Amino acid sequence: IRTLLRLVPAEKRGAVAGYAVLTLLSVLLRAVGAVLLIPLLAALFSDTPSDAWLWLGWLTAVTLAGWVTDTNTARLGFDLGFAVLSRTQHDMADRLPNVAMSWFTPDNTATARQAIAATGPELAGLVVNLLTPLIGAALLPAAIGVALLFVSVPLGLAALAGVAVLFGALALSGRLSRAADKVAGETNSAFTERIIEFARTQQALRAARRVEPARSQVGSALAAQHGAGLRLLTMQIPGQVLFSLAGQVALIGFAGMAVWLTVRGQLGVPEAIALIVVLVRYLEPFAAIADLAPALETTRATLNRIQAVLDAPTLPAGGAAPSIEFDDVRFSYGDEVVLDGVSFTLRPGNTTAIVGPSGSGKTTILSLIAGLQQPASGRVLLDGVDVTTLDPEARRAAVSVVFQHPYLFDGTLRDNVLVGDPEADPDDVTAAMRLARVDELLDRLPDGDATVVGEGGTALSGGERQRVSIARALLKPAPVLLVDEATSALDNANEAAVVDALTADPRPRTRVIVAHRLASIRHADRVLFVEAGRVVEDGAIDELLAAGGRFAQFWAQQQAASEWAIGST
Amino acid sequence: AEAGSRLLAPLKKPLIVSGVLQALITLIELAPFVLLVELARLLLGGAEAERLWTLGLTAVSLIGLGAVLAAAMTLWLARVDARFAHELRGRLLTKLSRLPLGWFTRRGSASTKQLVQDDTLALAYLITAAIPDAVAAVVAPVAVLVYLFVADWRVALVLFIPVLVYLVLMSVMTIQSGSKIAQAPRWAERMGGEAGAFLEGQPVIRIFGGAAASRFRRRLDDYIDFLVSWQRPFVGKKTLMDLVTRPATFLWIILVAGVPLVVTGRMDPVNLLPFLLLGTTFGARLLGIGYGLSGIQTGMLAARRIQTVLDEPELVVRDPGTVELDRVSFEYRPGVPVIRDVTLTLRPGTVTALVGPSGSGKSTLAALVARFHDVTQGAIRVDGRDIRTLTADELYRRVGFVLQDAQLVHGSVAENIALAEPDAGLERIRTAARDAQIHDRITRMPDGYDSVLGAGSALSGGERQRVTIARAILADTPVLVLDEATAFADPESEYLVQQAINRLTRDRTVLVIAHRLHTITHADQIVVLDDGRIVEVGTHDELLAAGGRYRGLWDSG
Ligand SMILES: Nc1ncnc2c1ncn2[C@@H]1O[C@H](COP(=O)(O)OP(=O)(O)O)[C@@H](O)[C@H]1O
Numbered sequence A: 001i002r003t004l005l006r007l008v009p010a011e012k013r014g015a016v017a018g019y020a021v022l023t024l025l026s027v028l029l030r031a032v033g034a035v036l037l038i039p040l041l042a043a044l045f046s047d048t049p050s051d052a053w054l055w056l057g058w059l060t061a062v063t064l065a066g067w068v069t070d071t072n073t074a075r076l077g078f079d080l081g082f083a084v085l086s087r088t089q090h091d092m093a094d095r096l097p098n099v100a101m102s103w104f105t106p107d108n109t110a111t112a113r114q115a116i117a118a119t120g121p122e123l124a125g126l127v128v129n130l131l132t133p134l135i136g137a138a139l140l141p142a143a144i145g146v147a148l149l150f151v152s153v154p155l156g157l158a159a160l161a162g163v164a165v166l167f168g169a170l171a172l173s174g175r176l177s178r179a180a181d182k183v184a185g186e187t188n189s190a191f192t193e194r195i196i197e198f199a200r201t202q203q204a205l206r207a208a209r210r211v212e213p214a215r216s217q218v219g220s221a222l223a224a225q226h227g228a229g230l231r232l233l234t235m236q237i238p239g240q241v242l243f244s245l246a247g248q249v250a251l252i253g254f255a256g257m258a259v260w261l262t263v264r265g266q267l268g269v270p271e272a273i274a275l276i277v278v279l280v281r282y283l284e285p286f287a288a289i290a291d292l293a294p295a296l297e298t299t300r301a302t303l304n305r306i307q308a309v310l311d312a313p314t315l316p317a318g319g320a321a322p323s324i325e326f327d328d329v330r331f332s333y334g335d336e337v338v339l340d341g342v343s344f345t346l347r348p349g350n351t352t353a354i355v356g357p358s359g360s361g362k363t364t365i366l367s368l369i370a371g372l373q374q375p376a377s378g379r380v381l382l383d384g385v386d387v388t389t390l391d392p393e394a395r396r397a398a399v400s401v402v403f404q405h406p407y408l409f410d411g412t413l414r415d416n417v418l419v420g421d422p423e424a425d426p427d428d429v430t431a432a433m434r435l436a437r438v439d440e441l442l443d444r445l446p447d448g449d450a451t452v453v454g455e456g457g458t459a460l461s462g463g464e465r466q467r468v469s470i471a472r473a474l475l476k477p478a479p480v481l482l483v484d485e486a487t488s489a490l491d492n493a494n495e496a497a498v499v500d501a502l503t504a505d506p507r508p509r510t511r512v513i514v515a516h517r518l519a520s521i522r523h524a525d526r527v528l529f530v531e532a533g534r535v536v537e538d539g540a541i542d543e544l545l546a547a548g549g550r551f552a553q554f555w556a557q558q559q560a561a562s563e564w565a566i567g568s569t
Numbered sequence B: 001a002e003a004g005s006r007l008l009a010p011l012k013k014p015l016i017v018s019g020v021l022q023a024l025i026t027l028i029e030l031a032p033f034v035l036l037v038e039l040a041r042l043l044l045g046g047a048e049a050e051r052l053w054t055l056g057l058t059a060v061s062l063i064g065l066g067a068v069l070a071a072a073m074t075l076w077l078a079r080v081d082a083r084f085a086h087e088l089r090g091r092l093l094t095k096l097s098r099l100p101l102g103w104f105t106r107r108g109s110a111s112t113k114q115l116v117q118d119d120t121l122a123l124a125y126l127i128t129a130a131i132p133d134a135v136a137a138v139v140a141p142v143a144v145l146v147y148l149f150v151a152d153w154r155v156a157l158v159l160f161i162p163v164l165v166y167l168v169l170m171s172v173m174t175i176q177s178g179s180k181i182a183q184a185p186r187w188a189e190r191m192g193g194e195a196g197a198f199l200e201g202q203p204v205i206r207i208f209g210g211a212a213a214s215r216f217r218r219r220l221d222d223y224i225d226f227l228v229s230w231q232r233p234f235v236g237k238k239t240l241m242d243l244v245t246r247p248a249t250f251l252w253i254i255l256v257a258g259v260p261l262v263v264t265g266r267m268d269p270v271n272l273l274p275f276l277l278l279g280t281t282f283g284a285r286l287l288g289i290g291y292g293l294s295g296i297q298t299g300m301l302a303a304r305r306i307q308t309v310l311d312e313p314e315l316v317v318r319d320p321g322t323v324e325l326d327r328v329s330f331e332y333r334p335g336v337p338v339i340r341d342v343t344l345t346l347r348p349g350t351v352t353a354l355v356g357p358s359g360s361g362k363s364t365l366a367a368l369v370a371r372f373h374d375v376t377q378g379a380i381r382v383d384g385r386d387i388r389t390l391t392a393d394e395l396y397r398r399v400g401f402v403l404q405d406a407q408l409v410h411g412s413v414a415e416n417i418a419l420a421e422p423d424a425g426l427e428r429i430r431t432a433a434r435d436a437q438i439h440d441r442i443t444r445m446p447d448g449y450d451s452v453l454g455a456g457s458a459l460s461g462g463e464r465q466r467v468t469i470a471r472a473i474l475a476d477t478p479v480l481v482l483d484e485a486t487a488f489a490d491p492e493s494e495y496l497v498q499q500a501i502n503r504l505t506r507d508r509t510v511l512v513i514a515h516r517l518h519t520i521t522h523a524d525q526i527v528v529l530d531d532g533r534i535v536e537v538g539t540h541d542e543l544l545a546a547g548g549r550y551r552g553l554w555d556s557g
């Protein structure tokens, strides 16, 4: 397996060699211990049992050497387990900040969360709980088979050839057992999907007075499907029964072979009984592996998660208001294209609004500029410099963003705002707090900006959280500011804070805003109307309204939408 | 505890028979090891080849008999599970049509998919796999232990020497860190949350970074330090606790205890043979009981959840669009008021509005009128009838509603508009759609009115909302319960949704969950709520003249 070897740090590539050679030494000592039953038992069942003392002396000497190598491999197992835990978690935590934001789909995020959180106690005990029993049980039937060659060549060939048959039975049993679980899971999911739809649309059905016809329809469908699916059952042996049957048949086959030799005179009776015991020592590891099928299945899953995270794609890498240029930009979330040949130049030092219907590609533009994502085709440039070719520190300092979601984290409110630039002076924080209109919120909080705003701290409303986020973006000294409007419906002060951020900031920098309502774009210098991933209209506020284009119609709808009253016009 | 056993009440007789068959099958699976001991006793006694043949035939027939029983049990146990699971899905289906309609918007509870798909599958593994696997895991060590004690009681006792050393070291290792075993699940839960936060707050860490970037890293290092400090001191205990149970250790104890007995004449050497065959792996058999009983626990938790859902309360039935609320109070959780002493009269044809801060209980009071929950105290009356006395056919024919997160059923658009009244013709449906400002996009679809809809569709939030508003218009309910958040759910489609709601609201009693006070100026009756209690009631201008909490809210706008 290649993923597990990749987890090994460079420090422990030596200790893995010691672990491997001592694991082989352990398997050889167990095999010699099992084959030492051939003379020990053959003398125990003989006319003179007293000849068994010598082979018990060698057996216990092999046993003590077995314990010494077994504790050393366990010690190296615990050391490798902790080293693998620290190595993978730290390398996995260092990987993700460099990963492109396209990778973080909900399913990919689920694996990354699983790989980080649920792999703690498992990786620490991976090698001791799984590899050492797995490797010892896998190599021991072949070790005993090879060792019996020195007792009898055809015997060792027969016992060694039986390893291939019995491992084949394990593989076939694994295939049948997993296919059965696949069918059992899928059939149940086919039965219950109608029930999930019935529970999903319950408000629609109940309010529409159709709940009972819909309930009967689903009940009839379930009844017919079960009646058809119950008759398809047939008397199948499961996977585990197949393997246990293969073990017993091997047991009776070897015992019958030993007795047949005894009747032919080719073996003595004590030696035949001893071979019967040793050929039970040989079959026993196959049962030991079958007990590791659940543990091996889970470990294969989590290592697949860790492989997925560690194989995530990473972005490449190399104070006046820069100009933002778009040239033939195309970007897609896999196959779903969101931008189709978009091209524009944001004039340096000016505020450009971005507007359009729901969906579209408005938010994707700001994520491209800030370096969260790299374009699939075309280029995004800052003063003629490609964003991808920028150094990591330069790109971090280049752009400031106000996100759709505030993304507040556990900490004090001032700590939530100081992350923009910790080197800023207290007066800079006060000024950024004033423009963001968070000083009004400090009057509500008991401790002011020192109050905790985390999950276990204070429950800030949507508008207040956005005003904290605006405080982040204004504080940062980046030569570019990006805005993505999202406010609580009632909080008009949030719109006032956004207006102040666009206008009241004395810092010289290019500004971009994705907007939803007219209160912010009214102060903008120009507007880009984006629909279906393309700029269907472009111009200034006066230019666009004079033209009476799509933006004018959008302007009319929103202005009307800001004036209605229920029970009247 | 009884909730799990109460669901599996009808499966008492099949599960008992399944356990008995698995006990029988495991004994038949251990029988070949007994026959090898008889075979050795035959060989040492110089038995003729005829007796060796019969023993060989007996062993082969038992292998065939065990295979046949295990196949026959699997088929019969699958049929039992398939019949019980079908019964259960029928019961879950009927319960989902009787639960209170607010049960589908729960907080802090398992999803419907987990309760229906995952838990019903966990029951299927419980009945068919976990119980027979647990019965085998308990009967195999017990059958082995009894046989090895019958063979010889002296070498059987020294099989417990590694067992006592395991339990003693397990007990020493457990008390020595008993606090940490209790902390460890909570560390995992904390890290699951922090991993979610780190993955959620990724863009901030990209562009801002700073304390946010190293917060997760430092807490990850604390967790790894906790695991290492917790488990590293138990290397010595855990290694010694593992070597004692190994087959190599059992074999040495068996032979060092049996060879002195055999050599000195205190034992028949064939009485040591049962221990060499079965007793070497005896330690690994006892360690398999725990995994066997774990399967029962995991399945019984799922049986716990399913029976808990089936034990929920339902909507009991007792006994011009005017609505009367009279001394209504409501508890989501016991002893935690959310509505307290609210009284209102939504006069016929008048638009009543609920206003207040977030968490004031305004949304709940609209959910109560539609009967998403039953009021714990007081009453709500519609057209002079308490809503408790009304059936779902009667109540929702009088009290329609369009709340947030509207839904579309699997079917064509024509059924979705005409869901309330399928007998309506396409002319009536088209007028209703044009009334809701959706006819334009419907014709814009390739298939027109025959366009199929369901759990996944290309329509945006505003578009499916206007489809639902078209449904409500064609439902013709004199009373209406409306959530103002449906308007600004799609700001780009805001004006169209407003026109649809404007058309919907006419000659109909209306209840509004208002969030923007500037959309309320012409409502017939404003209601101000904070912490579940009505503060002021009156028209827009009258309350502004009063200058109470409503004017403070308006100034806060
Ligand atoms: N995590 C994601 N995975 C796949 N597609 C996404 C993801 N996030 C956004 N999109 C796509 O982006 C489009 C919306 O563009 P966006 O710039 O977000 O506009 P808006 O700001 O109006 O949402 C959607 O059609 C959606 O398919």
Ligand SMILES: Nc1ncnc2c1ncn2[C@@H]1O[C@H](COP(=O)(O)OP(=O)(O)O)[C@@H](O)[C@H]1O
Pocket (backbone or CB within 6 Å): B105, B106, B107, B332, B338, B357, B358, B359, B360, B361, B362, B363, B364, B365
């Ligand atoms: N999903 C939920 N399930 C159960 N109870 C809830 C849920 N969400 C909120 N609650 C409770 O009901 C109340 C609803 O508050 P309310 O003010 O009506 O909502 P809004 O802030 O949208 O107006 C809250 O105070 C809370 O205690």
